[PDB]
Design a protein around this nucleic acid. Sequence first.
RNA 1: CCCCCCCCCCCCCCCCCCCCCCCCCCCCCCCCCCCCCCCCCCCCCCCCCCCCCCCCCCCCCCCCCCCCCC
Lengths: 375, 54, 375
Amino acid sequence: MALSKVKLNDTLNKDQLLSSSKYTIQRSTGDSIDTPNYDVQKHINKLCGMLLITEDANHKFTGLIGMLYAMSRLGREDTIKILRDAGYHVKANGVDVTTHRQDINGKEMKFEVLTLASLTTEIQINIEIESRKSYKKMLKEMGEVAPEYRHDSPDCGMIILCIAALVITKLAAGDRSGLTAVIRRANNVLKNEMKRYKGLLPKDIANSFYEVFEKHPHFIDVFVHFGIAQSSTRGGSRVEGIFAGLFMNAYGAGQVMLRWGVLAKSVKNIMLGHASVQAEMEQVVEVYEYAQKLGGEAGFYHILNNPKASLLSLTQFPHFSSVVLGNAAGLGIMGEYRGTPRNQDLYDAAKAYAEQLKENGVINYSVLDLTAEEL
Amino acid sequence: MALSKVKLNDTLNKDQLLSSSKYTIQRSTGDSIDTPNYDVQKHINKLCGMLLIT
Amino acid sequence: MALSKVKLNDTLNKDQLLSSSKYTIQRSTGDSIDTPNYDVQKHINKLCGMLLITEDANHKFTGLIGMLYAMSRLGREDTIKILRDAGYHVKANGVDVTTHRQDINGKEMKFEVLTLASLTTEIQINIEIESRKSYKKMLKEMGEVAPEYRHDSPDCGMIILCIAALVITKLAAGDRSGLTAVIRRANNVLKNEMKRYKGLLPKDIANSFYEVFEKHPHFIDVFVHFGIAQSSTRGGSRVEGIFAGLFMNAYGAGQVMLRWGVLAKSVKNIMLGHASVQAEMEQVVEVYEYAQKLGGEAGFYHILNNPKASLLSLTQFPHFSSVVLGNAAGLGIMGEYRGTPRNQDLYDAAKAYAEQLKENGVINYSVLDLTAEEL
RNA sequence: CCCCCCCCCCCCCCCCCCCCCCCCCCCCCCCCCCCCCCCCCCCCCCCCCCCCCCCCCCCCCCCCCCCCCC
């Protein structure tokens, strides 16, 4: 009645404030950005392949090249549009294919290159030279190169962007610490591809992507939205199916704590009954309902650095955090998770009860009814 | 009442995200694709038969 | 029935009055104000860096320069618009980049400067000279300067505005008394940045900002709204994520008393039952509901000096104030808080009961039900 | 007057899938009887009868409000 009516909604208040700014900032990204159009797309995918067939390839530029493929999928107009939507001033840089004439080994040669701010028509021909070497050597070994082994395969563009997706997976912690998790998965999920391409080195590309995301942080946006627009797709090659599968493992990065909450609720961990956890409840519901109201776009809040993401934190509730993290310890899902309970006693109690829960599965007969049962 | 109300819909959330992309990709299939019209149809069916009697 | 129907709503009445003025005041801010546009933004961020690489830099002008960065983000038109919305007459001052020619050390040199009312093209070149010194010295020490160490890093603008945000955090008390709290946090939260920049002195900038807010109090508005518009953002660098995180710690400054109320309610502190606290209840609900109705924009009322902020005070209720402040004492969250209970007996009673509450966590089983439990 | 505390967040694991299988099959038109309907008696009506009728203006006292604290 009298005091139980006094409360303050802070989580939703804060959203409401950020949501309703009457003014906007705009960032100046850099001097140029290349916006490759649909028409260059095949050529980029071709350049991607060249790196994949090259054994022990230099993967310095693979991060950046991948982003170029993603942008040539989105297309010149759509790509600019997502940059302006994120808020950055864009010096758009049109991308044309031109032929270059240079004497490699004395003899003069032609090359297919792109006019790129970010990539010298030098370091380009160098990938094409290096590829040809790993290719004539490949031709010698098997006699004739199969289509799945060449740089033509329509998958090459997407294959590269696969480990890119995996990078997004672990970009939650902010540092390079995912890298060993990234290689580990790339090996099981992508093992088939690694067999067709000697240049598919997980460690090296994953680093080249981490590199391009840390350095140019606006790309992380572009990629996330490309990834969405590619997952919106109606059909596609098994590799685009893999891409989307992985990309979607990254929905909800940083909010692990949240799902583990739903879990603690689902298993009916007893430590949720505790008085000092019951005290937080009112607010913890606020936030869960906030996540609900936010919907889909919410999962990617931690990966892009969307300010509003702080709001989803369950950290602000130490007692609940502790029983939820405990529950997830006792069920053996946490670790090597570097989260720390703020309440050691509760964590221990919840871990304890949770370990006991997996022991005894009691059958519940009031979920499904039957008018005659002999047993 | 209190905890049994806390949940997160993830399956439907995810759909809702993919469904509502504001941008789109477009793939470059190959150099050509043949799009035979209605008017060639009988001839194609004929070519099909040829393989079936052989 | 008869007397229990007589009441007067004063809190909501007062709001309703202020909300519905039919006339308006307009203040004359000063002779000029510079409104840098989007197009100068990179240059300002560059000038910011110069101060951050300079070891033992003079941070007198850093307060004002920070505000210039924020205003070049908002953009010339948006910035003016928020000034007129706050109500101040604006002598808008357009900002152009021009080259200056001056002989430093005998030899003649070029400089990139801005035409600024608030900043002499003298004191500008002086930051650029000082930076170059700390830079060639830096070049000597490590041989080659990494990108995270230069004045180019896109973060420099925002990094500076970070301690600015922290200043807003503690601007609740009105005086310089936050300053030691400001340095303390800047050191843990920003420790990584302080490693990349020898010119990131928390004490010195924080003072330079306090300075520019006390002196030109209209900027405090501009900054708050920039801060909102930057937190509205969709994505961003880890540093813009930090910025927003801190900025939002300042939502609800001055209304600490209010949240501690919700707390006293949440823990069911017994002293809320007391007769003389029950007597205030009717009004205390009025105010809590007022805060609810006000919503998001309400949190920043104390930081800007929004008159309407007096209304949120729980001071006008001594008995409730005292049990709420007591509760927060007994739970060890207050201190070194300089709030005084107006009722010593109630404060002591509530502190007492509150200390006893953390002792015994009694498990409540009627929140979650189960059709069969053996234990 | 009001205000005055502490405080970024974040950190795990992980694609997915994989079986079997066309369908269908019976029987069979429907209907068929009886039978127009109706038929009586019967205008309606009728009396008595204007309404109204008293008394009556109304009003009349005392009184500005307000004052603390913050």
